Design a protein around this motif. Structure first.
Motif, mmCIF file in Angstrom:
data_model
loop_
_atom_site.group_PDB
_atom_site.id
_atom_site.type_symbol
_atom_site.label_atom_id
_atom_site.label_comp_id
_atom_site.label_asym_id
_atom_site.label_seq_id
_atom_site.Cartn_x
_atom_site.Cartn_y
_atom_site.Cartn_z
ATOM 1 N N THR B 66 0.793 -1.198 0.000
ATOM 2 C CA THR B 66 0.000 0.000 0.000
ATOM 3 C C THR B 66 0.841 1.270 0.000
ATOM 4 O O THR B 66 0.586 2.220 -0.790
ATOM 5 C CB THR B 66 -0.990 0.037 1.181
ATOM 6 O OG1 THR B 66 -1.691 -1.201 1.179
ATOM 7 C CG2 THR B 66 -1.965 1.183 0.994
ATOM 8 N N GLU B 67 1.804 1.337 0.915
ATOM 9 C CA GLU B 67 2.549 2.600 1.041
ATOM 10 C C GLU B 67 3.406 2.814 -0.199
ATOM 11 O O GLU B 67 3.608 3.955 -0.634
ATOM 12 C CB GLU B 67 3.455 2.572 2.281
ATOM 13 C CG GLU B 67 2.704 2.758 3.586
ATOM 14 C CD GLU B 67 2.030 4.119 3.763
ATOM 15 O OE1 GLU B 67 2.228 5.016 2.916
ATOM 16 O OE2 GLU B 67 1.226 4.295 4.742
ATOM 17 N N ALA B 68 3.847 1.734 -0.838
ATOM 18 C CA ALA B 68 4.612 1.933 -2.074
ATOM 19 C C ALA B 68 3.677 2.500 -3.177
ATOM 20 O O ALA B 68 4.114 3.241 -4.046
ATOM 21 C CB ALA B 68 5.246 0.592 -2.544
ATOM 22 N N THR B 69 2.378 2.185 -3.131
ATOM 23 C CA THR B 69 1.418 2.839 -4.030
ATOM 24 C C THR B 69 1.103 4.287 -3.603
ATOM 25 O O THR B 69 1.055 5.212 -4.439
ATOM 26 C CB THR B 69 0.125 2.000 -4.109
ATOM 27 O OG1 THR B 69 0.495 0.631 -4.337
ATOM 28 C CG2 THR B 69 -0.818 2.503 -5.214
ATOM 29 N N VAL B 70 0.900 4.494 -2.320
ATOM 30 C CA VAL B 70 0.717 5.849 -1.774
ATOM 31 C C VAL B 70 1.836 6.769 -2.254
ATOM 32 O O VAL B 70 1.593 7.928 -2.627
ATOM 33 C CB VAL B 70 0.758 5.800 -0.247
ATOM 34 C CG1 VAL B 70 0.822 7.217 0.350
ATOM 35 C CG2 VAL B 70 -0.522 5.089 0.290
ATOM 36 N N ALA B 71 3.059 6.257 -2.167
ATOM 37 C CA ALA B 71 4.253 7.063 -2.444
ATOM 38 C C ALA B 71 4.144 7.699 -3.840
ATOM 39 O O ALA B 71 4.638 8.820 -4.055
ATOM 40 C CB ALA B 71 5.509 6.221 -2.327
ATOM 41 N N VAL B 72 3.481 7.001 -4.772
ATOM 42 C CA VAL B 72 3.346 7.513 -6.140
ATOM 43 C C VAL B 72 2.067 8.312 -6.324
ATOM 44 O O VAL B 72 2.056 9.401 -6.935
ATOM 45 C CB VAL B 72 3.355 6.377 -7.164
ATOM 46 C CG1 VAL B 72 3.143 6.933 -8.581
ATOM 47 C CG2 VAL B 72 4.643 5.582 -7.072
ATOM 48 N N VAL B 73 0.960 7.792 -5.775
ATOM 49 C CA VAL B 73 -0.299 8.323 -6.191
ATOM 50 C C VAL B 73 -0.842 9.427 -5.307
ATOM 51 O O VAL B 73 -1.784 10.112 -5.702
ATOM 52 C CB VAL B 73 -1.404 7.267 -6.351
ATOM 53 C CG1 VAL B 73 -0.980 6.122 -7.260
ATOM 54 C CG2 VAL B 73 -1.937 6.822 -4.996
ATOM 55 N N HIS B 74 -0.256 9.604 -4.128
ATOM 56 C CA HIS B 74 -0.829 10.550 -3.178
ATOM 57 C C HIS B 74 -0.774 11.979 -3.710
ATOM 58 O O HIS B 74 -1.740 12.740 -3.591
ATOM 59 C CB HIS B 74 -0.131 10.473 -1.814
ATOM 60 C CG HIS B 74 -0.874 11.177 -0.727
ATOM 61 N ND1 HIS B 74 -0.614 12.487 -0.380
ATOM 62 C CD2 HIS B 74 -1.889 10.770 0.070
ATOM 63 C CE1 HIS B 74 -1.419 12.848 0.603
ATOM 64 N NE2 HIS B 74 -2.211 11.830 0.885
#
Ligand SMILES: CC(C)(COP(=O)(O)OP(=O)(O)OC[C@H]1O[C@@H](n2cnc3c(N)ncnc32)[C@H](O)[C@@H]1OP(=O)(O)O)[C@@H](O)C(=O)NCCC(=O)NCCSCC(=O)c1ccc(O)cc1
Ligand SMILES: CC(C)(COP(=O)(O)OP(=O)(O)OC[C@H]1O[C@@H](n2cnc3c(N)ncnc32)[C@H](O)[C@@H]1OP(=O)(O)O)[C@@H](O)C(=O)NCCC(=O)NCCSCC(=O)c1ccc(O)cc1
Ligand SMILES: CC(C)(COP(=O)(O)OP(=O)(O)OC[C@H]1O[C@@H](n2cnc3c(N)ncnc32)[C@H](O)[C@@H]1OP(=O)(O)O)[C@@H](O)C(=O)NCCC(=O)NCCSCC(=O)c1ccc(O)cc1
Ligand SMILES: CC(C)(COP(=O)(O)OP(=O)(O)OC[C@H]1O[C@@H](n2cnc3c(N)ncnc32)[C@H](O)[C@@H]1OP(=O)(O)O)[C@@H](O)C(=O)NCCC(=O)NCCSCC(=O)c1ccc(O)cc1
Lengths: 141, 140, 141, 140
Positions: B66-74
């Protein structure tokens, strides 16, 4: 027993309060060969930084419940039970209250038991489900 | 702060009080396609039987994916959240560490998918997790 | 062998052409203990009514590939191998061309082998993946 | 037409030519929350080892879960498509029939989830499938 886990042995390697389950507060309510329930009060310890219950918390509650429900039956038969696959899908977040899990056994084979676990919030809403396969093998000691 | 991606000025729960901070998850590397994290085995990570809790591997995978996705999409106005987590367990871990490596295999408009491998201190593959991460417009 | 499946026995209960695999046209290309590939030409037989390859077709190709790749190694050891769990996720539809599957073994335990299968289209795009657990048990005959 | 939901005047592939029509899948009941289907075991449904193909159970589940979502959402301008299919196999089927029953457990705005149980002629649970169905606006 601590967290009301099945008491199948006189001692355990790790005391309940020190385990992950004890730390986050999982507690088993009902426990029968085909169905078991457990619940946990949501506190920050159960949450991720974004404020909702961590996806791992639902996985973990499902895992403990489905494995221990298997343990309750198979330990006295000389078997150990341990999770082999845990597939949890998340339908709705839980911000606070409790998470309540119900585990229904749907297959009990000689090597694998399978349990469906529903995880609901205090309003009864289905927030996650977990399909758990539990390996059952003869104990080494 | 477990070295999670610093994407916001405030988060509802401080690291040290989260499940992640309580068990001690720390992110090591993070890029858009690949991220790593690890945790020391302590009793907090274990079930009463003395081996690492199955939920610990799931949790580590869930946070990392999740946080690796957050890191890009936030910064794009999106929120990221786990939609499915399938973890399979091949070998127990009694002590030492668990090391996770998440590899992005699909990044679609509404779903990203990561394969996570969880290894013991000997490098042995103890568990894997196939993580689906929903990506949605952030709510006002 | 038919579809180039591993030839581990002198006869099989069902001829290749009559099986599901034969019917839809699955064919194995490479086969080694840790990796195997197979492919299939997309025709209507592989599609659902909406015109894209059926989700079951990817499941099936993964299943045959991962099970047979296990069979190739374990049959002569007196074991049977059969699928226990097949988890396929779908990232992009395939309208036509071929579907190409590559199976990589990631765990070979005494009771369960696990394979990750990638299913790609003719442009190389990852259209689906399947995580397969294959039970391995001693043969009954 | 396998008795699939009649939601459109034209479909790209006729039933009899589809995978479904080739193996003989037929839908029996369909409502928004629950749908059933079945198939006779023939060699077309089998692997070379003589038991029903694992892919057959997956395929039956995929068609039933998806089309049971189509049946509701198609007239709303949406398309439905499988996003994840997890099938677990408990007992083989050598001959007879396979009967699937799909129970809707979540219907969210972008994802519906169905539990599918696949039984033999003796009513024994031979396989289950947890199906996630993506629901998206239909393309023009
Ligand atoms: C996976 C497993 C073997 C685990 O079973 P277990 O815990 O060891 O044993 P358990 O005592 O519960 O046995 C349950 C039933 O499984 C079957 N079984 C278990 N062990 C064996 C064995 N050694 N040999 C034959 N059948 C067995 C048997 O039907 C048994 O009932 P019974 O005859 O003993 O009454 C069992 O749950 C099972 O058989 N599941 C069904 C497996 C299945 O049918 N998978 C789908 C097919 S996947 C394969 C495939 O698609 C394929 C396609 C193309 C191709 O070329 C090759 C393969
Ligand atoms: C699940 C999902 C729709 C999620 O996509 P998303 O995040 O909304 O959108 P994303 O922008 O990343 O789109 C990626 C690709 O998905 C496809 N897609 C996405 N949204 C749509 C849409 N609204 N309409 C048509 N295609 C779409 C499209 O191919 C797109 O590529 P492009 O045309 O945009 O270049 C996409 O990952 C996907 O299409 N996955 C493949 C789904 C699939 O093929 N499943 C297997 C078939 S399962 C169904 C089945 O077997 C069946 C059998 C019998 C029967 O009677 C009925 C059904
Ligand atoms: C599932 C399975 C047992 C299948 O293994 P197998 O094919 O029968 O045996 P295999 O020869 O490949 O053994 C692989 C390794 O598994 C372990 N293992 C296998 N059989 C046994 C056994 N009878 N007793 C102890 N360990 C065993 C052992 O570590 C083995 O290595 P070695 O000591 O033989 O070198 C094995 O792959 C495995 O151990 N996977 C890891 C299981 C795991 O750690 N799951 C996560 C924990 S899930 C449980 C849980 O969270 C929980 C939480 C709270 C609570 O109250 C209770 C439980
Ligand atoms: C996955 C999805 C977003 C799909 O929803 P959808 O089809 O787009 O939308 P749907 O309209 O059906 O919404 C259902 C509910 O989802 C929630 N939701 C949906 N979209 C949004 C959104 N954009 N923003 C906030 N909440 C949303 C919301 O609760 C909604 O209810 P309501 O407020 O609309 O009444 C929804 O099913 C969902 O929220 N599932 C639960 C996700 C979840 O809680 N996963 C477990 C946490 S995984 C993450 C994790 O553990 C983590 C750990 C450490 C760390 O550092 C980071 C993460």
């Amino acid at each position: 027993t601590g967290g009301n886990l099945p008491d199948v042995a006189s001692h355990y390697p790790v005391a309940y309060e020190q385990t992950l389950d004890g730390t986050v507060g999982f507690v088993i309510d009902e426990m029968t060969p085909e169905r078991a329930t457990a619940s946990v009060e949501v506190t920050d310890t159960l949450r991720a930084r974004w404020g909702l219950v961590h996806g791992g918390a639902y996985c973990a509650l499902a895992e403990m419940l489905a494995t221990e429900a298997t343990v309750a039956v198979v330990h006295e038969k000389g078997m150990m039970a341990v999770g082999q696959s845990n597939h949890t899908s998340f339908f709705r977040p839980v911000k606070e209250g409790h998470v309540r899990a119900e585990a229904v056994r749907i297959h009990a084979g000689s090597t694998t038991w399978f349990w469906d676990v529903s995880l609901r919030d205090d309003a009864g809403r289905l927030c996650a489900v977990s399909s758990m396969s539990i390996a059952v093998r003869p104990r080494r000691d």
